[PDB]
From a paper:
Bacterial human pathogens secrete initially inactive nucleotidyl cyclases that become potent enzymes by binding to actin inside eukaryotic host cells. However, once delivered into the target eukaryotic cell, the effectors bind to actin, resulting in more than 10,000-fold increase in nucleotidyl cyclase activity. Our structural data together with molecular dynamics simulations and enzymatic assays reveal that specific interactions between two independent regions of the toxins with F-, or G-actin lead to stabilization of the catalytic center of the toxins and high enzymatic activity. Thus, the enzyme is activated by an allosteric activation-by-stabilization mechanism.
Author numbering:
A (entry chain B): 4 to 40, 48 to 375
B (entry chain A): 19 to 413
C (entry chain P): 2 to 139
The structure:
């Protein structure tokens, strides 16, 4: 009838494709490559990565929220015309927004979609809501840690409760800087951007969650049985020990970095305590992990343990870790715009021409 | 308990076809990298040549067909008429491809030398050469075999070649016995063996990454302009230096090749300890190409992660199972048929893997079987059907 | 009367309940759908809606005509917005419903959606009617 386009947004990456399908058709880093000063510029994606040595890179979003709209439009041009190669005026478009996106922002999203691409219809879905849609659930608490922001988001009947939303400006890139730093302190020398991407790959390949951090630190101090080696492209090999779990321990103790901030477990709990007493039980039983930084082995069990230690002895604690959750969000978007019930959910070009952008504040929640 | 054992026995036919030592190595790669690795069938003379480790193998340029009988099935003949599967017009196109290779100098035409251990395999183990007998008129032992459905006559000369008593094969053209020829490697002037063709390679969503997934036809100017002279992966520096090696490596691999598979080809060719451009996955091996003709694929084989096969109860969903598929020893797996393959994929995606697909498999078979959008969807969307049931409680 | 507007807003079958309640001075139900929930809402609940403590009802919830609801969005005190969004609360998997309160110059417009009707339709209807009444100086 129409495959509506699914267009996710993120601090580091983008995911795009057709609604009604199991995985994104297309993905890219959302950055844009201007010249260094010119006709032959290639603005987007893998081409911009490839040319990155002679180009100037920019990020339109920082801490989930769009900034340079001008080149977000360029990213949309590359998504619609280059990756899916389908006329986006011809299809309704599903859009995604970071939590707490400023009002005027969502109006500008609407303006661009309706005035520039003449989309017949659209919807804007909060990423965490898609993540809860992604596996069996309409109500629950999402712990969404991506590249920019970390959010704890209780959701009732598919509606995030902004009053109880807590935000933590701590994510993977700060951990990357930290891992480079403490890897040098082990006797190594990680300092370049190439080295940053290598440390990123090490973190992605080797970190895990210790159940007893102090005991594990003792084990690592008393032997090398958990230490690993990693071979650099220059074939040199570094070794990593307790850092494997010291890195993600920072999720629970940001003081390891000199930060005076609660761990994710305690902020999840405080989020729960901000919510209606009567729905917390279900929230307690629907703790959902999303984002690439939640892919560490052992995080669910450890969270279970920490909440159990903190929560009433009566409280039932359930940690849900969907196994591809690093992209579960996009699945949810495909689902949402798939539905017949969605027919009412379409924003129409006509509604926008008649009533203007502020309908989005009334209609889109 | 035959019900599983026949499923075991049919894999034994590929285990005859394909060496278990390589199944060991590639199972270890399937452990080390969390991926499914498919491979097409190869057959026992391919076992003989693989055990030789002696020669290069078929590629993309040498589009001539893996031959269909006997010694020659070991190789590709200079005339596809001795490689009879599919029909005349196709073998004529393949002779076209041969003539193209010959004019390009990416194939030479080469003479065929066999040693008694190979004959003993072919007669004794392979049951596929008929007993030789000396003819003084040919000065050769005559032999015969059903290359097609036709039995054909061949005359074999015992000759001191490389100081071994090789058999050199000969055949009658226009009533005159001429030495039989196969495709030779332009570099080593030695006969190209069949390759390994590959079938789908499947990865978890946990490494779904566009810098790896994307398929990219291009060649030299686009590559060398695209990457700055130190956005380097070491061998690529030679791709700055030489257009020829780029045209060999990427142009033959180019296929519709994904960059992940381009890196993995280097990994696998290293791991198999071959050298000097010797390989078994030079083809780039997608079965996304338009000529992924289906019946060539069978019986197929895979390597899968050790963790893979202990994951949950049988009977996943409407895709259902009770006998755990055509399992094979040495950690390998086999499959007989597209329905078995499609079920095996449907389970793998239920291990959150992502299936590569191509319409030609369905077009080969003319029943609706490989649409992802409809058919090959994984049962977490059946779980979204349960989500809509919840909404039906809402709705 | 105000019931003509209750009748009008209920006609399309998307909503199961509607009402107009005065919130100034001492609140009182000016008009409501007979035989439903909103007709029995009390003035004290209105006082809570327009009161200074905008935090306790997040943790304790509230009831409207005995139906428990949770506040999702609050723009009820913002000029140009004048709306609060809620959803009902149920036990044992019983359906929940979307609620919209809009605030005009003199009245509160309240709407309860049916099963599965998304809150945005109710919100659009209520806001457009509210805008029409403000335009009428109400
Ligand atoms: N194997 C891995 N292990 C741990 N973290 C990973 C792994 N792979 C990717 N990541 C992290 O996942 C993050 C990107 O995930 P994702 O694309 O969901 O974030 P995003 O949506 O762009 O961020 P935000 O939600 O703040 O906008 C990065 O911080 C990256 O470092
Ligand atoms: Ca994001």
């Amino acid at each position: 009838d129409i495959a509506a386009l699914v267009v996710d947004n993120g601090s580091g990456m983008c995911k795009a494709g057709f609604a009604g399908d199991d995985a994104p058709r297309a993905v890219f880093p959302s950055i844009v490559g201007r010249p260094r000063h010119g006709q032959k510029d290639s603005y987007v994606g893998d081409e911009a990565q490839s040319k990155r040595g002679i180009l100037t890179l920019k990020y339109p979003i920082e801490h989930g929220i769009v900034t340079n709209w001008d080149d977000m439009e360029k990213i949309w041009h590359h998504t619609f015309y280059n990756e899916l190669r389908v006329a986006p005026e011809e299809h309704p478009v599903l859009l995604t927004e970071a939590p707490l996106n400023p009002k005027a922002n969502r109006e500008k999203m609407t303006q661009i979609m309706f005035e520039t691409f003449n989309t017949p219809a659209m919807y804007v879905a909060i990423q965490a809501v898609l993540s809860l849609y992604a596996s069996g659930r309409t109500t629950g608490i999402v712990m969404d840690s991506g590249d920019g922001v970390t959010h704890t988001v209780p959701i009732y009947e598919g509606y995030a409760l902004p009053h109880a939303i807590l935000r933590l400006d701590l994510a993977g890139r700060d951990l990357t800087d930290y891992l480079m730093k403490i890897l040098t302190e082990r006797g190594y020398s990680f300092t370049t951007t190439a080295e940053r991407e290598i440390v990123r790959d090490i973190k992605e390949k080797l970190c895990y969650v210790a159940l007893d951090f102090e005991q594990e630190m003792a084990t690592a101090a008393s032997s090398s049985s958990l230490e690993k080696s990693y071979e650099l492209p220059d074939g040199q090999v570094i070794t990593i020990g307790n850092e494997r779990f010291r890195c993600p321990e920072a999720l629970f103790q940001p003081s390891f970095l000199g930060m005076e901030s609660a761990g994710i477990h305690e902020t999840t709990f405080n989020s729960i305590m901000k919510c209606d007493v009567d729905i917390r039980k279900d929230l307690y039983a629907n703790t959902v992990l999303s984002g690439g930084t939640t892919m560490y082995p052992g995080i669910a069990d450890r969270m279970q343990k920490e909440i159990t230690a903190l929560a009433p002895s009566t409280m039932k604690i359930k940690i849900i870790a969907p196994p591809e959750r690093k992209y579960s969000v996009w699945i949810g978007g495909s689902i949402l715009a798939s539905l017949s019930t969605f027919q009412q959910m379409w924003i129409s070009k006509q509604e926008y021409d008649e009533s203007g952008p502020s309908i989005v504040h009334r209609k889109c929640f | 308990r035959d019900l599983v054992l026949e499923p075991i026995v049919q894999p034994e036919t590929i285990e005859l076809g394909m060496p278990d030592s390589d199944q060991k190595i590639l199972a270890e790669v399937a452990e080390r990298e969390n991926v499914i690795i498919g491979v097409r069938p190869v057959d026992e003379k391919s076992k003989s040549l693989i055990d030789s480790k002696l020669y290069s193998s078929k590629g993309l340029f040498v589009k001539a067909k893996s031959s269909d009988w006997g010694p020659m099935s070991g190789f590709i003949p200079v005339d596809q008429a001795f490689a009879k599967a599919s029909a005349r017009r196709d073998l004529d196109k393949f002779n076209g491809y041969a003539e193209q290779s010959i004019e390009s100098g990416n194939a030479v035409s080469a003479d065929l030398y066999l040693n008694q251990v190979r004959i003993d395999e072919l007669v004794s183990k392979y049951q596929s050469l008929t007993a030789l007998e000396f003819d003084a008129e040919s000065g050769m032992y005559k032999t015969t075999a059903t290359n097609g459905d036709q039995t054909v006559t061949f005359f074999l000369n015992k000759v001191t070649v490389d100081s071994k008593d090789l058999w050199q094969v000969h055949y009658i053209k226009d009533g005159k016995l001429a030495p039989f020829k196969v495709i030779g490697d332009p570099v080593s002037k030695q006969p190209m063996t069949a390759d390994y063709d590959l079938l789908t390679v499947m990865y978890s969503y946990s490494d779904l990454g566009p810098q790896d997934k994307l398929k990219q036809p291009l060649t030299w100017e686009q590559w060398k302009e695209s990457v700055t002279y130190e956005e380097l992966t070491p061998k690529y520096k030679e791709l700055y230096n030489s257009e020829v090696l780029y045209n060999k490596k990427d142009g033959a691999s180019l296929g519709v090749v994904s960059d992940r598979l381009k890196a993995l080809k280097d990994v696998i060719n290293t791991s198999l300890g071959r050298t000097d451009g010797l390989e078994m996955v030079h083809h780039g091996a997608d079965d996304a190409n338009p000529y992924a003709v289906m019946a060539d694929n069978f019986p197929a084989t895979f390597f899968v992660p050790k963790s893979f096969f202990m994951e949950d109860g049988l009977g996943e969903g409407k895709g259902s199972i009770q006998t755990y598929f055509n399992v094979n020893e040495q950690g390998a797996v086999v499959i007989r048929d597209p329905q078995e393959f499609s079920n095996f994929q449907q389970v793998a995606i239920n291990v959150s893997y992502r299936a590569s697909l191509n319409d030609k498999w369905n077009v080969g078979l003319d029943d609706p079987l490989f649409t992802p959008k409809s058919k090959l969807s994984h049962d977490f969307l059946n779980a979204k059907e349960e989500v809509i049931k919840k909404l039906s409680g809402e709705v | 009367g105000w019931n003509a507007y209750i009748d009008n807003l209920m006609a399309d079958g998307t909503c199961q309940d509607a009402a107009i309640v005065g919130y100034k001075d001492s609140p009182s139900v000016w008009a409501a759908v007979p035989g439903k929930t909103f007709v029995n809402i009390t003035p004290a609940e209105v006082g809570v809606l327009v009161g200074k403590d905008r935090s306790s009802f997040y943790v304790n919830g509230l009831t409207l005509g005995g139906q428990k609801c949770s506040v999702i969005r609050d723009s009820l005190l913002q000029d140009g917005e004048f709306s609060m969004d809620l959803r009902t609360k149920s036990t044992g998997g019983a359906p929940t419903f979307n609620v919209t309160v809009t605030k005009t110059d003199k009245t509160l417009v309240l709407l309860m959606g049916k099963e599965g009707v998304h809150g945005g339709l109710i919100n659009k209807k209520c806001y457009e009617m509210a805008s029409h009444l403000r335009r009428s100086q109400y």
